[PDB]
Amino acid sequence: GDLADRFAELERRYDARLGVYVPATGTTAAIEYRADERFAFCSTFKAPLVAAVLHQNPLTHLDKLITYTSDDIRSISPVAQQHVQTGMTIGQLCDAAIRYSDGTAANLLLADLGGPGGGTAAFTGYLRSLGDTVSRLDAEEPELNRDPPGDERDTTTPHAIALVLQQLVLGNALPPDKRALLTDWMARNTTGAKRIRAGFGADWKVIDKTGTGDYGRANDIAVVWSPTGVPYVVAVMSDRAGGGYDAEPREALLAEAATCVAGVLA
């Protein structure tokens, strides 16, 4: 069989560009499809953003209260827009950024990293520290979802983001306590049920972070565990840029790509 052919078939069926990377393991070959092509992050960056904040702070920092105003709600923020009067702690922001893809939470965590560009330069530097020489964050939410096709701003590659996530969740980029917090937030994500999760049977554990954007962008980055406890990182990125900036993102493409991956990994 030819898995690349099957991924190409999905692209034709959905009128999409699909990128996949599943890193090789001691027991499995890599799966790679358009893995070194650029795709917009969209909200997938929020997982390594949380890691960046965890990395540079003691865990007591999760209790730091962050205050903000209604004027800070500039992007879709399901949690933050209900806590303008209370504020939210850094831990609550991490939780919201991952589990509800909260954009204000993400922007506040970017600001917590500090430096020029509201934290976007700092975040890119955190990726550089993980060996990622390609990815770049140039804008805050929501502008980071809106760059035109071909613009390298706010892009990663499936290969790069998969190896970032590998290091964060399965590797030693974070100490194991911080690692566990990231993993738990991703494990309780609320936004991913129709993406990679939908391609793996219920006996597989899936943790993930979605992203969605203009030009039909729909991404999901996950770590999955087999029914025997073997983990794999699965990065699936897509866009439908040929359809214009208002092309519909297609969750089902990601679910089907995931089902193809699940077929190989079973």
Residues with Cβ within 8 Å of 229's Cβ and at least 6 positions away in sequence, in order, are none
Please tell me the distance from the alpha carbon of residue 115 to that of residue 133, in angstroms, as a whole number. 20
Do residues 222 and 207 touch, judged by C-beta distance below 8 A? Answer: yes
**Distance from chain centroid for Cα 76:** 16
Please tell me the distance from the alpha carbon of residue 179 to that of residue 59, in angstroms, as a whole number. 11
4-265 topology per CATH: Beta-lactamase (3.40.710)
Q: First and final CA of the chain: distance in angstroms? A: 16
Nearest of 100, 35, 43 to residue 235 by alpha carbon: 35
Please tell me the distance from the alpha carbon of residue 253 to that of residue 123, in angstroms, as a whole number. 29
77 as an active site residue: the answer is no
Laid out side by side, the sheet with 31-33 consists of: 31-33, 17-22, 231-239, 217-225, 205-213
Please tell me the distance from the alpha carbon of residue 264 to that of residue 266, in angstroms, as a whole number. 6
Structure obtained using: X-ray
43 as an active site residue: the answer is yes
3-state helix, strand and coil shares in percent for the chain, rounded to the nearest 5: 45, 15, 35
Amino acid at 37: E
- Provide the pairing of β-strand 217-225 with 205-213: antiparallel
Residues with Cβ within 8 Å of 10's Cβ and at least 6 positions away in sequence, in order, are 16, 18, 253, 256, 257, 260
Do residues 22 and 31 touch, judged by C-beta distance below 8 A? Answer: yes
Catalytic choice (11, 32, 140, 141):
141
Catalytic choice (11, 32, 43, 77):
43
Amino acid at 191: T
Give me the helices (H) in the chain, please.
3-14, 46-55, 90-99, 103-113, 120-129, 158-165, 176-187, 196-199, 251-265
DSSP one-letter string for 82-132: G-TTT-EEHHHHHHHHHHS--HHHHHHHHHHH-SGGGGHHHHHHHHHHTT-
What b-and-e string marks burial along 56-81, b requiring 16 or more CB atoms within 10 Å of the CB? eeeeeebeeebebeeebbebbbbbbb
Query: Which residue ranges make up each domain of the chain?
Result: 4-265
